[PDB]
């Protein structure tokens, strides 16, 4: 419980030639964008509801992005569910036999923590957990 | 607007074998489930926020969810989109270029009206508009 769906990770080729389609056909608003040279990704913030589409486009060909795009395709790359304390998420879900991909928190997309359990505790499916400092107000 | 994340279709080859991961790790509530053998799919519906998590289980072989399972793997399938009115949206869309897989809204899970976009104007994201009729109290 608390549980959130915090946003949807989506790998695209290009933020600019799927806004037409996102913003003009789905007629999702456009939150505004960021630079992560760090994941190598650029990301793009679509508000859905509570919840966010974000698309995330490859800066080097060398980008987990990139590689994803090469092997899979452009398509959905993951679901993030937002959570009160990330530490003791993944001690919980590791307790529990969850594999992660990362054992302690990186910096995600927004100034978030996240942490990426393993597909294959989740039979193909990349789930996310993401905590966010809680902003509102002025 | 008014658009909002009505649910995740995710195509798993046994509901009853990921639910320890989705009840148990991840703690998302289990709704229900529907038989839909119209469409040839069981169904596992769980709470994530205000959206929900579909598992979609093939009945049998020739189930569109057996077909994608057997070329993609298990994993995430669609990402529906909850609509106030779905003829208007789809009439909308088709005139700003996208092309529908169902041009009229077919029966879907839990009784909602539903049509899905083609992944080819969505650079391989199957998007479903999903109208439902409101029902909250007592
Ligand atoms: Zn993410
Ligand atoms: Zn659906």
């Given at each position: 419980?608390?549980?959130?769906?915090?946003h949807?990770?989506?790998?695209?080729?290009?933020?600019?030639?799927?806004?037409?389609?996102?913003?003009?056909?789905?007629?999702?608003?456009?939150?505004?964008m960021?630079?992560?040279?760090?994941?190598?990704?650029?990301?793009?913030?679509?508000?859905?509801?509570?919840?966010?589409?974000?698309?995330?486009?490859?800066?080097?060909?060398?980008?987990?992005?990139?590689?994803?795009?090469?092997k899979?395709?452009?398509?959905?790359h993951?679901?993030?569910?937002?959570?009160?304390?990330?530490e003791?998420?993944?001690?919980?879900?590791?307790?529990?036999?969850?594999?992660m991909?990362?054992?302690?928190?990186?910096?995600?997309?927004?100034?978030?923590?996240?942490?990426?359990?393993?597909?294959?505790?989740?039979?193909?499916?990349?789930?996310e957990?993401?905590?966010?400092?809680?902003?509102?107000?002025?």
């Amino acid at each position: 419980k608390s549980n959130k769906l915090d946003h949807i990770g989506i790998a695209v080729t290009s933020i600019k030639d799927v806004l037409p389609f996102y913003v003009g056909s789905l007629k999702l608003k456009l939150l505004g964008m960021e630079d992560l040279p760090s994941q190598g990704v650029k990301i793009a913030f679509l508000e859905i509801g509570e919840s966010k589409i974000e698309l995330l486009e490859p800066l080097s060909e060398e980008s987990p992005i990139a590689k994803f795009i090469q092997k899979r395709g452009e398509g959905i790359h993951h679901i993030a569910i937002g959570v009160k304390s990330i530490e003791e998420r993944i001690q919980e879900v590791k307790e529990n036999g969850v594999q992660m991909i990362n054992d302690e928190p990186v910096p995600g997309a927004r100034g978030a923590q996240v942490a990426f359990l393993h597909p294959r505790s989740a039979r193909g499916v990349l789930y996310e957990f993401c905590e966010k400092k809680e902003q509102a107000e002025n």
